Each structure stands twice: as C-alpha cells, then as structure tokens.
Amino acid sequence: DEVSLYTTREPKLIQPLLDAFAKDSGIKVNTVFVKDGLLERVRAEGDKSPADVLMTVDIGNLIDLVNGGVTQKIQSQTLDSVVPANLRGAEGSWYALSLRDRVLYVEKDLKLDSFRYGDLADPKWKGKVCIRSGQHPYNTALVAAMIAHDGAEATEKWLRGVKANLARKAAGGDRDVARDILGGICDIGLANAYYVGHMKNAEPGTDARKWGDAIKVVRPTFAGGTHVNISGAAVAAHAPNKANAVKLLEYLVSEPAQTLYAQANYEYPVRAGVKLDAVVASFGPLKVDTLPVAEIAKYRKQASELVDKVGFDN
Ligand SMILES: O=C([O-])C(=O)[O-]
Ligand SMILES: O=C([O-])C(=O)[O-]
Numbered sequence: 001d002e003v004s005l006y007t008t009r010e011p012k013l014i015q016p017l018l019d020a021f022a023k024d025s026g027i028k029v030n031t032v033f034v035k036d037g038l039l040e041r042v043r044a045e046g047d048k049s050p051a052d053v054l055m056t057v058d059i060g061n062l063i064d065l066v067n068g069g070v071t072q073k074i075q076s077q078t079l080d081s082v083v084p085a086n087l088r089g090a091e092g093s094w095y096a097l098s099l100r101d102r103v104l105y106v107e108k109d110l111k112l113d114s115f116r117y118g119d120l121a122d123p124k125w126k127g128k129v130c131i132r133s134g135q136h137p138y139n140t141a142l143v144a145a146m147i148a149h150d151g152a153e154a155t156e157k158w159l160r161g162v163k164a165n166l167a168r169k170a171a172g173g174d175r176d177v178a179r180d181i182l183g184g185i186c187d188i189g190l191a192n193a194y195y196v197g198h199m200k201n202a203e204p205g206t207d208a209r210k211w212g213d214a215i216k217v218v219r220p221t222f223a224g225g226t227h228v229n230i231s232g233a234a235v236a237a238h239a240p241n242k243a244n245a246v247k248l249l250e251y252l253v254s255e256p257a258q259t260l261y262a263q264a265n266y267e268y269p270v271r272a273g274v275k276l277d278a279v280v281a282s283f284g285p286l287k288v289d290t291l292p293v294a295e296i297a298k299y300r301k302q303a304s305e306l307v308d309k310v311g312f313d314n
C-alpha cells in the first residue's frame, strides 16, 4: 500500500507531514525529489511511470504539467471546498497548496501604510526602489497579472516608471532588497513575503535577522487584492495508486497538513482558518487577488516581452 510523490520541493520542507500521513493511513509514501525537468521526467517514464502526485512551485510550472499531458482530472469535494476556485484548475486538473504573495518591503519607519502596485511608478520614488531582474519568474508573474487587470499599455508605462525609479540595476535576489533598504540604498522594493518570514525568524546575531529587523511588509493591491503565486499539485496521468494519490492530495489541504506545509517555507496556507507563523500573521490581513491565477500563465510570455521591450534590466 503505497503512493509516490514526485516533488520539485525539497522533501525537507514536507517530510514530517508526509511521515504523519504514512503513520496514520498505513500508506507508504515514496518521495522522489526532481530538482528540475519534472514534465520531461514523467513524460519519459511514460504509461508505467510510478508517479502518483506531482508537486511543484509557480502556476506556470503547474499548468505546463497539465498542458504537457502528464496529469489527470479528479473529482474531490474535499479539495474543491478547501481551495478557492481562482486557485484551482477546472475539474480537478491542478490545485494550489500554498500562496506566495509578492509584497513591498519598506524601511521600518517609513510613513507608508498601504500601497497599490501602480504606486511603484510614482516619480517621487526615483532612486528609492530595489527589485531583482524583471525577467525573474516572480516578477514576470506579477507583470502578467498586471496585463490581465490593467492592459498592456498601462503595464508598459508602469514598467518604464519603475525602471526609471530603480536605485540600482535589477539583479540579485529578493532578500537583497532587504539588505539594500538596511544599507540606505533604497526605501522600498518588491519581493516575496515568505523571505521576510525567514529573515525575521532568524536569530539575533545573524545578518538575516538584521535585514529582517530593518524592514516591514506592506502588501500592495491592484484595485483590490494582492498578487499571489503558488505552490501546487496534480494527480499524475498514469498514477498506479490513484485512490492513494487522491488521499494524499486531500491530506495536503487538511488543516494539520496545511499548518505544517505553509510554516515550512513561511508561505501562506491555501486553506482558510489555518494557524499562521507569528511573523506571517504580523503582516496583517491578506486580501488575495480574485484573478484566476491561470491568467498569469496566459499572459506570461507577453509580460516577458514587455520587460524586454522597456530594457528593464539595463
Ligand atoms: O529567490 C530568491 O531570492 C531566493 O530564493 O533566495
Ligand atoms: O527556491 C527558491 O526560492 C529559488 O531558487 O529562488
């Protein structure tokens, strides 16, 4: 009695919760870590692939699995009643498991209590904004959502305004935004909330905690909700243990599993009423963009092309 989880997530983030599932259910969980090329591996393994559940990060990566024919549709009242409609595919094709909101890091004492994404292009922020490469998936997803909401013309004008406002070249990573706010290079920047979970939970006497202490989170909205990307999962097209695969996926959205799952990378659980990490809770109420996240995949290439058009990374 077994189930195979193919995951692009390091099993370290999920081993305790998988062990609980196995203990309680009696179903052996086989964890297969696939660092990259998940689609390609499952395709190559063909009709007899051992894969039961496919787990990955980024809505585009998840939709690529579905469009690549390596998933199957499932019916589950458990999953559909837990996962909001905008965060799951039609007829059980894929499901979000956690939310990765892209927020504004803000110098801790700056007078700024709210923000719209569009505000980042205000001329007053010139020389005051940090951001990583505009071509990084975290950013192209946000740009894709902006096209969906506001159109290509408005999105291009935002990109040009933000580029004009950068304090340094769009490069590095998300936590570099916090470093550079601490360093007085910029006052605000776009980066993922979960990194602030990591930094603020780091122990005093680390550089991570020094960066965390330097900043606060303000969650911008579109107007209006905050942009989220996701981690998520789907049942594999040829799952040899389909009943167990559905059991595992249903378990992954249960309250106990969600509590552990989100805490692991300081992400936000998909299931309502799940206890948050204390740092994450301190960010205040989250309003999730009502946009179907599948729209992010729809507009991704257009978004990437706009980023290139404006020479965002120059
Ligand atoms: O994306 C990043 O910046 C990271 O994971 O460190
Ligand atoms: O895992 C991550 O967050 C990355 O590689 O950026």
Ligand SMILES: [Fe+3]
Residues within 6 Å of the ligand: none
């Ligand atoms: Fe990252």
